[PDB]
Amino acid sequence: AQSVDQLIKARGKVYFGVATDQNRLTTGKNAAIIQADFGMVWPENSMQWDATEPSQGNFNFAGADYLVNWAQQNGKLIGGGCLVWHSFLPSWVSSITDKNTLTNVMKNHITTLMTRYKGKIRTWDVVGEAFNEDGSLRQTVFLNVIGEDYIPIAFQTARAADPNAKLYIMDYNLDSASYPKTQAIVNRVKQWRAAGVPIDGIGSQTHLSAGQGAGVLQALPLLASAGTPEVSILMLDVAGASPTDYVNVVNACLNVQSCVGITVMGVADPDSVRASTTPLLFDGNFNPKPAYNAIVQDLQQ
Numbered sequence: 001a002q003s004v005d006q007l008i009k010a011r012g013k014v015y016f017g018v019a020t021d022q023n024r025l026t027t028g029k030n031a032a033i034i035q036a037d038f039g040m041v042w043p044e045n046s047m048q049w050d051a052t053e054p055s056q057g058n059f060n061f062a063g064a065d066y067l068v069n070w071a072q073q074n075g076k077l078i079g080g081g082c083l084v085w086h087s088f089l090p091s092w093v094s095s096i097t098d099k100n101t102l103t104n105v106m107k108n109h110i111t112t113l114m115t116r117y118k119g120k121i122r123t124w125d126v127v128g129e130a131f132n133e134d135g136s137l138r139q140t141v142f143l144n145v146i147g148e149d150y151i152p153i154a155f156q157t158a159r160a161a162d163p164n165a166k167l168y169i170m171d172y173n174l175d176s177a178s179y180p181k182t183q184a185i186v187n188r189v190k191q192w193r194a195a196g197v198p199i200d201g202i203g204s205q206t207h208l209s210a211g212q213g214a215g216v217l218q219a220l221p222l223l224a225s226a227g228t229p230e231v232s233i234l235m236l237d238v239a240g241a242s243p244t245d246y247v248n249v250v251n252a253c254l255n256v257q258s259c260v261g262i263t264v265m266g267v268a269d270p271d272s273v274r275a276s277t278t279p280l281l282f283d284g285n286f287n288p289k290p291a292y293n294a295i296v297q298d299l300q301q
């Protein structure tokens with residue numbers, strides 16, 4: 001059984017990665033599969049805001065430290081995130097109505113996480129899910145209280161905290177070139193970078209239904225046209241796990257020079273949030289599914 005990470009490196013890419021955390025690494029056969037087959041790990045939950053700063057200035061790094069130490073011992077690259085994401089905010093953040101207060105809170109959260117792991121993290125997802133489906137900016141507490149400047153502020157703060165890390169904006173429903181969100185993230189990233197905002201990458205949080213892989217072949221080149229040094233596929237899963245969809249996503253990555261790699265949402269189907277759709281690359285016995293073998297064969301050829 002061949003390693004997709006090794007094979008994608010042989011094709012000139014950086015990694016094939018996976019999301020995990022302490023719970024997964026101590027159960028099933030997740031650790032053994034990650035050791036063999038994946039070259040980068042991301043914390044699924046242990047670096048989100050609610051996990052790391054459940055009360056203001058009272059940080060909890062136990063789960064994140066476990067992941068980082070496991071990755072270093074096993075020679076894996078590490079991704080971290082998401083530093084600013086409305087979906088994982090504790091209530092103490094959402095209640096803040098004062099611009100200066102919230103700006104300092106946000107800067108402190110960013111700097112504290114990034115400093116702790118300085119030099120050890122390849123990629124940080126700095127801002128997540130900042131766009132509405134129509135391409136307008138999502139009206140989260142950060143937009144409502146700080147305004148549109150919160151995104152530049154987050155990236156400039158992140159660059160200062162660890163200049164080694166590649167800083168990404170991420171979003172979902174960027175899977176079709178003509179979708180309004182895809183157009184808008186491309187346009188705004190172009191503008192931010194032209195003003196000197198340090199956005200190194202766009203990460204596409206790719207949750208596909210059956211048959212949607214084909215559209216990624218056109219959407220990913222469009223995302224790359226924003227001119228960031230890197231793009232990536234993140235959080236990848238596919239309802240039904242058809243080889244056709246998975247191979248299309250891999251081929252999109254191969255066709256886009258700036259696409260550094262792909263991260264899947266987990267290891268085995270039963271641990272998915274949509275397990276009924278069996279959307280991952282390993283089954284409930286931890287055997288590689290037809291889609292895994294198809295990706296291997298595509299990368300070997």
Ligand SMILES: O=[N+]([O-])c1ccc2nn[nH]c2c1
Pocket residue numbers: 018019042043044045080081082083125128170233234235236263264265
């Ligand atoms: O690619 N990922 O699986 C992944 C998981 C959780 C994250 N939080 N921020 N960015 C993330 C990427």
